[PDB]
Amino acid sequence: PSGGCLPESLLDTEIDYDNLIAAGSMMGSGGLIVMDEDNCMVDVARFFLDFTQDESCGKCPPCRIGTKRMLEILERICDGKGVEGDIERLEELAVGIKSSALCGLGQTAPNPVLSTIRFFRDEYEAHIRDKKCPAGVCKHLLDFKINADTCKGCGICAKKCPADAISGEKKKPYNIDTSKCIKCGACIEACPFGSISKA
């Protein structure tokens, strides 16, 4: 959480003091974590942002109040309740907090948000405008579609839908009500054929 992400445009970066601070990140203890296309990069910023809220020593008002007041902007995107222009409200707290911290967390807390926006601005717009997760990770922003060719139509997933958003007749691929299920995902593993994919 003390540093930032290093995307594919910076593979020839000499990792030292003056280059990675010019890249807007700091080594700290030296932990190195590699990400791929299989996880959404939106909510993992909230994952490091989970760390700072539950550990903050509770003295300075930014590291108390400004932290959790910055969660609800992310999760309303993460459940599809956000509006356009909220990412520019994030940029208001971007330079305010870092100049107004006492505890060592406060200087280094929002820098994961700072690192990702200057490369991955477009994928937020997919979360904000298209209402679609590129990695299919954000639970409330994903929908399930079945494939007609691979589905047998046995109806095992029909027994495992708690909201009963799937219905139909035997021996044929069923129909999916997108808005009716809670997107729990209990039906995808119960199919022995793997006929359910994330859209």
Binding site: S56, P61, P62, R89, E92, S99, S100, A101, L102
Partner: protein
């Protein structure tokens, strides 16, 4: 002492080492905002409003507790530091309750002044606040943590100045609240009800319960005749409520305003204080002629006797059985004036105005009832009186003057200095010296102990055979150390220890109205109210000895018989039991 050279805004200053930029710039007529800081007690700087940029620094530093250094340049008018102060301001305002129309503090809340000070306009934010729990179960103090903004000034003043410290900070983040221990209430722990906590909070997180609905019902009941008592120190700072200049006395205007309220009768404390001093001296001469329990202490302020009973009750034989002077005059009014006017004692109501907060606790006590009836009914402080007279709203500055009445309106300087530092026992020494050896003294010096301020020693002979030793301690820490040496027996030689609960004496009662941090910076306010009361005492042009008062001698002859009578033992003298400690 070391000299430090530094330039602020291009201006060079030589200061003693250890002083900070805040007070140095205040000396240079420059102001820095503050919520966190108060002198000599709280230097943590957690408010994060007093920011300023220092050249040669990685990030910004708070001017509150940043120490001075040689060769440093300070500039206080960059756009970035203004932006920092403003953004901290809306992050505070998104937590702190915005219905400031119905706040108790209302007018001079520090947060409103700072909100207008930085001139913020937009609140673009929606958030979730702390939990709303009303602890309306205590006797004096009600907390509303929906308003509390984690100043930690309250816990600091209860920690060091009080040396009581029944408050702490728990939880993480939003769960970090200031609370008593075990998630209990203040009535469920040993809170002294001092009043320093409720006066030093800058946003009105601490309030006192209204009793004014019962007062307004009482004045609206024709079957009840109302008597309203007055304090010697109620007019010490009341005029500051109306923007008056400093140390103003409005006693005649005060009396006229009270008589414009439809209140039936108005008395004061002064005769009760005089007679209380009388039996204090009488029991003194009794115990020095019989070899009584020594060292002896008073029983005046209820807060410290509650302190010494709940905490360390081992000195319980050293108390005096007599009540507070306001209790004495309440009982005297409830019996002798009642039989004088032939009015049933269940048909009038008594209300008294005290700047000390312990009286609304003391009225709830069960053993201080006489003739099957309570001694006093309703206790009122100056804030309550203040917006009550502002509620009836007679424009105060244009009233005429009025005097008090027959019998009980006369005043002497010995009970003018009743609220002052040690004037009660000073007058006690005057009375006992005049009784035994006819000595005329107008003032007695005190000795300051080096190492701790606030403790004063005096030892002046009453007779060449009998010398009496006097110490007066004010403030909870001072109480704790004198109690510690009393258990050590260091002052086994002395005769009198005088305990004032709140610091600076009975004249710094928590019931006095709120003062600003700026006003506490400029003039130390007990000095100005001390000058007002000392000019009042020198302005007492009739009597400066208590026992010469003919009215009290008349009441002695007609109803009180002889000093320390068996009837005085029956009426004027009571007993306290073991109150439970839940600490």
């Amino acid at each position: 002492m070391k000299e430090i050279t530094f330039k602020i805004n291009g201006q060079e200053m030589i200061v003693p080492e250890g002083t900070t930029i805040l007070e140095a710039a205040r000396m240079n007529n420059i102001d820095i905002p503050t919520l966190c800081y108060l002198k000599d007690i709280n230097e943590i700087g957690a408010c994060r409003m007093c920011l300023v940029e220092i050249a040669g620094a990685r990030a910004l530093q708070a001017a509150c507790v940043y120490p001075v250094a040689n060769g440093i340049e300070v500039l206080t008018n960059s756009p970035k530091v203004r932006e920092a102060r403003r953004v901290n301001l809306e992050l505070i305002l998104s937590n702190h309750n915005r219905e400031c129309t119905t706040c108790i503090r209302s007018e001079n809340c520090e947060l409103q002044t700072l909100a207008t000070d930085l001139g913020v306009s937009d609140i673009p934010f929606e958030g979730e606040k702390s939990g709303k729990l009303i602890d309306d179960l205590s006797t004096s103090v009600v907390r509303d943590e929906s308003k509390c903004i984690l100043c930690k000034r309250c816990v600091s003043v209860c920690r060091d100045v009080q040396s009581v410290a029944v408050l702490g900070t728990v939880g993480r983040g939003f769960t970090s609240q200031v609370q008593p221990v075990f998630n209990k209430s203040l009535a469920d722990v040993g809170c002294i009800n001092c009043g320093q906590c409720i006066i030093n909070c800058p946003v009105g997180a601490l309030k006192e319960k209204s009793d004014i609905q019962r007062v307004w019902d009482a004045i609206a009941d024709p079957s009840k005749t109302v008597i309203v008592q007055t304090a010697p120190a109620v007019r010490a700072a009341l005029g500051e409520e109306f923007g008056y200049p400093m140390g103003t006395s409005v006693t005649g205007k005060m009396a006229a305003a009270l008589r414009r309220l439809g209140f039936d009768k108005v008395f004061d404390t002064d005769f009760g204080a005089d007679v209380c001093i009388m039996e204090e001296g009488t029991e003194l001469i009794g115990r020095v002629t019989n070899g009584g329990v020594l060292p002896m202490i008073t029983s005046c302020s209820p807060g410290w006797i509650k302190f010494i009973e709940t905490y360390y009750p081992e000195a319980i034989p050293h108390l005096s059985s007599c009540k507070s002077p306001q209790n004495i005059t309440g009982a005297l009014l409830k019996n002798h004036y009642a039989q004088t006017n032939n009015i049933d004692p269940k048909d009038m109501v008594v209300v008294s105005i005290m700047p000390c907060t312990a009286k609304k606790y003391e009225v709830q006590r069960e053993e201080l009832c006489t003739d099957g009836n309570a001694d006093v009914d309703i206790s009122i402080t100056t804030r309550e009186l203040a917006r009550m007279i502002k509620e009836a709203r007679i424009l105060f500055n244009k009233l005429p003057d009025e005097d008090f009445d027959d019998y009980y309106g006369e005043s002497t300087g010995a009970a003018v200095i009743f609220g002052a530092t040690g004037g009660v026992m000073e007058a006690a020494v005057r009375t006992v010296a005049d009784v035994l050896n006819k000595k005329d003294i107008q003032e007695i010096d005190y000795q300051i102990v080096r190492g701790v301020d606030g403790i004063k020693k005096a030892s002046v002979e009453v007779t060449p055979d009998l010398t009496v030793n006097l110490v007066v301690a004010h403030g909870g820490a001072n109480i704790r150390e004198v109690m510690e040496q009393l258990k050590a027996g260091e002052l086994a030689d002395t005769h009198f220890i005088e305990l004032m609960a709140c610091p600076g004496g009975c004249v710094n009662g928590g019931g006095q109205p709120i003062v600003s941090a700026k006003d506490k910076m400029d003039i130390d306010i007990r000095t100005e109210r001390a000058k007002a009361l000392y000019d009042e005492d020198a302005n007492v042009l009739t009597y400066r000895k208590s026992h010469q008062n003919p009215s009290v001698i008349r009441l002695y002859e007609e109803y009180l018989e002889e000093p320390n009578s068996p009837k005085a033992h029956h009426i004027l003298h009571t007993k306290y039991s073991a109150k439970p400690k839940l600490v």
